[PDB]
Scaffold this active site. Structure first.
Site, mmCIF file in Angstrom:
data_model
loop_
_atom_site.group_PDB
_atom_site.id
_atom_site.type_symbol
_atom_site.label_atom_id
_atom_site.label_comp_id
_atom_site.label_asym_id
_atom_site.label_seq_id
_atom_site.Cartn_x
_atom_site.Cartn_y
_atom_site.Cartn_z
ATOM 1 C CD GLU A 196 -3.484 -3.618 2.135
ATOM 2 O OE1 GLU A 196 -3.409 -2.615 1.411
ATOM 3 O OE2 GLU A 196 -4.386 -3.847 2.967
ATOM 4 C CB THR A 208 -6.346 -3.029 0.280
ATOM 5 O OG1 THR A 208 -5.897 -1.675 0.387
ATOM 6 C CG2 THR A 208 -5.679 -3.682 -0.898
ATOM 7 C CB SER A 260 -6.742 2.394 -0.233
ATOM 8 O OG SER A 260 -6.304 3.451 0.605
ATOM 9 C CG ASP A 274 -2.156 0.899 1.096
ATOM 10 O OD1 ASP A 274 -3.247 0.591 1.599
ATOM 11 O OD2 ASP A 274 -2.020 1.987 0.534
ATOM 12 C CG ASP A 304 -2.763 1.203 -2.889
ATOM 13 O OD1 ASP A 304 -3.578 1.357 -1.950
ATOM 14 O OD2 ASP A 304 -1.551 1.485 -2.761
ATOM 15 C CG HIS A 305 -2.104 5.078 -3.882
ATOM 16 N ND1 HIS A 305 -1.348 5.719 -2.926
ATOM 17 C CD2 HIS A 305 -2.995 4.322 -3.190
ATOM 18 C CE1 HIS A 305 -1.766 5.338 -1.715
ATOM 19 N NE2 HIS A 305 -2.772 4.486 -1.810
ATOM 20 C CG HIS A 320 -2.560 8.594 -1.480
ATOM 21 N ND1 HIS A 320 -3.705 7.842 -1.657
ATOM 22 C CD2 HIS A 320 -2.151 8.337 -0.214
ATOM 23 C CE1 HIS A 320 -3.953 7.171 -0.534
ATOM 24 N NE2 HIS A 320 -3.042 7.423 0.386
HETATM 25 ZN ZN LIG Z 1 -3.547 2.999 -0.683
HETATM 26 ZN ZN LIG Z 2 -3.005 6.327 2.082
#
Ligand SMILES: [Zn+2]
Ligand SMILES: [Zn+2]
Ligand SMILES: [Zn+2]
Ligand SMILES: [Zn+2]
EC number: 3.1.3.1
Lengths: 444, 444
Positions: free
Chosen positions: B317, B150, B97, B46, B364-365, B407
């Site tokens: 995860e 997630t 997320s 993550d 995820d990013h 993010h």
């Molecule tokens: Zn995330």
């Molecule tokens: Zn975050």
């Protein structure tokens, strides 16, 4: 090994945002060849990490869009570019443009600021020197001053990147100074190297007179002429050149310093995404149509170089992506990434047609720019931009309180197409690139 | 060959920093297989972009070192993860997320905060739901609360990721609320989904009592028991589990909220690399030895799941790489990345032995953390760390003036190993992953 990676259709629908049309396996398998490469074109986006690529695609092509050049190389990986501390020999996590360029051009790590020498200040042969020795034609093109670290690293060996011409070399690189028995300044070593094609900016350093050697008393420009170089200064004269080789090498100086950037836009400011309107970039009026573009230089060079039966090695650099990143100017930075993309397209077109050309696109190191949410309240400089999607994208520069944003140490994308391109896949090091190129051209 | 990517020898010497022993072509060609995948293990870090990976590698293994798990996957690429604006349907450059997990689990883009529903709020089946219907075993493991976006995206369809249990769902997802004819809260939908193996934290929401339905009046924990779930709370109890299937599903709840992080270290601070000495991370003294690590959970899951003849789908995860990044805590962030690498190793060990397993590792990013020069004077939060190289590395968090770093939207690395792994190479989109998995397994 597809060539179209734009979103399939309606990005709000199931499968609409997909870039893959089907299974890659067979096509990927088809693109893997270990046969030798006859030509090599290495394109470098100075300071162009994954973030810079993402921000430019988002703005110019839209989130679901895709760069026909930059995004079209089938084999992809990530590589490390850390430098070394000169004193301790320990890793220095954030490299400058000099140490990284030396890494892929000589195969050895070095300290920030070093051009073509290791941490012991000992010289090592560059990929261009080796190419030239084997008979291959050689090209070196950049949008920066030709004395800039990146183009410089292929033809000069100095202990400090600041040793541009005779006057700076005597003070900062006394051991390389011509009067002191050294190889000379960057510009003097460039002239000695004699690559078949060399194009960029940095005309101002050519007005310096040599202090010693066979051409003392004459400006470096007078020497170039005296040694057989064809000197062009604009798109027109560049196009009228019909050949370039060792008897008539070409040298283009299209700017005193760095060539002007393509797009104009304001500088990011503190809370700029909140207090200032979103911006839309516009063409730079200070950039004349007589100043050739990166794609034009790339195309002319490829034409002159492919005349060599043995093959050629060409390095192309989009310098100002890095410069505009330092200056916290999203439009300047994005415009320069679009400019590079065009150059990559020219290269890919030739490579597909020719079929024995390895094309590589990557950056020397990562940089400051980040893509953040529209409402972000950041400590650094920010700016909101109107993208091709009709949506607002905010860019942030938050790693320096000084007047220049800093490089960053993150590993970044390296992509390739052609013979031996598989050696770019997975995690590798910037020095592996030197060896990958050496081995593709079968250089001894 | 493709398993070892550490620097060869002396990083100060020519060829010393190289990660490649030889030509990859034939080796890469050999790893390209389009035969069906019997099992799929998807590992998610993550907020683990390339920057986070580099920072953790530099720290834990040194610049020229390499992660035996994370860096050992041969096929690599970069993928986009932009979300959508709910009202306009235009791209939202920085995803959360929830929107990102929905994209890889259902194959359709969505708005930030949505779980298993598109911008129109219409439910779409997840890869786990399709795996379960096809007869395959299913596992969902994470170090975060099991209600976290997630793990939740695989088993729940709700309009707001905030709809953890009955109470929150009543007021934030009225249309999903059990009392109003909806499927229920995330936890209720999780219990309804009945994956064979579910391991994580988030026990506090299970203390909530249902408002309606067949088990109204009973805590969701009691409901779990009432429906045949084997419940484990620690490593000892997890380890004694013999099998986990549809008649005896496994539900592991290892903490009230998120599971404790591995390493401890101070939070980055303003001018921290300048005013404070370098830090060295230490193990977290508050972490109970009875709490399993991600690799122990990953390993047990693989053991219970592989008992299914048809195959299995497992998502794993490492959630806190993200949380610690938000918190600007380098040591917490790096330790969670090291934690994930161990899980990746367990997965790859199984995969290489089994031979029909597709292993995918990605994020995820992107996130906030940047690796900057030791002397950087940044406007945000910085910290110097003592790496395995005995050199100092500085990390910067400069995109938020709030108490949580943000993010970022940069495309990031995706790597895979096994049947159909070629579909991860080049530029793809996070939604393509959904189709790659569905195809590898032969779903629908
Ligand atoms: Zn995330
Ligand atoms: Zn975050
Ligand atoms: Zn640079
Ligand atoms: Zn720079």
């Amino acid at each position: 090994v597809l060539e179209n990676r734009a979103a399939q259709g309606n990005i709000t629908a199931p499968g609409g945002a997909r870039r893959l049309t089907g299974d890659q396996t067979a096509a990927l398998r088809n693109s893997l060849s270990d046969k030798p490469a006859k030509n090599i074109i290495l394109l470098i986006g100075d300071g162009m990490g994954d973030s810079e690529i993402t921000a430019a695609r988002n703005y110019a092509e839209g989130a679901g869009g895709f760069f026909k050049g930059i995004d079209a190389l089938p084999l992809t990986g990530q590589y490390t570019h850390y430098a070394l501390n000169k004193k301790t020999g320990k890793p220095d996590y954030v490299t400058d443009s000099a140490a990284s360029a030396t890494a892929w051009s000589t195969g050895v790590k070095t300290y920030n600021g070093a051009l073509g020498v290791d941490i012991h200040e000992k010289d090592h042969p560059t990929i261009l020197e080796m190419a030239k020795a084997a008979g291959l034609a050689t090209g070196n093109v950049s949008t920066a001053e030709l004395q800039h670290a990146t183009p410089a690293a292929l033809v000069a060996h100095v202990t400090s990147r600041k040793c541009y011409g005779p006057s700076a070399t005597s003070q900062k690189c006394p051991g390389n100074a011509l009067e002191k028995g050294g190889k000379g300044s960057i510009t003097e070593q460039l002239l000695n190297a004699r690559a078949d094609v060399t194009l960029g900016g940095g005309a101002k350093t050519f007005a310096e007179t040599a202090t010693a050697g066979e051409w003392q008393g004459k400006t470096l420009r007078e020497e170039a002429e005296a040694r057989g170089y064809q000197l062009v200064s604009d798109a027109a004269s560049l196009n009228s050149v019909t050949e370039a080789n060792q008897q008539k090498p070409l040298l283009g100086l299209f700017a005193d310093g760095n060539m002007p950037v393509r797009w104009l836009g304001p500088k990011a400011t503190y809370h700029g995404n909140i207090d200032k309107p979103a911006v839309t970039c516009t063409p730079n009026p200070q950039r004349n149509d007589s100043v050739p573009t990166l794609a034009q230089m790339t195309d002319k060079a490829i034409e002159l170089l492919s005349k060599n039966e043995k093959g050629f090695f060409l390095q192309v650099e989009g310098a100002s992506i890095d410069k505009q990143n330092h200056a916290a100017n999203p439009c300047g930075q994005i415009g320069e990434t679009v400019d590079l993309d065009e150059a990559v397209q020219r290269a890919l077109e030739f490579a597909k047609k020719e079929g024995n050309t390895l094309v590589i696109v990557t950056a020397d190191h990562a940089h400051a720019s980040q893509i953040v949410a529209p409402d972000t309240k950041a400590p650094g400089l920010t700016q909101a931009l109107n993208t091709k999607d009709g949506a607002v994208m905010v860019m942030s520069y938050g790693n320096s309180e000084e007047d220049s944003q800093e490089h960053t140490g993150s590993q970044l994308r390296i992509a390739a197409y052609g013979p031996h391109a598989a050696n770019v896949v997975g995690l590798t090091d910037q020095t592996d690139l030197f060896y990958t190129m050496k081995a593709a051209l079968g250089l001894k």
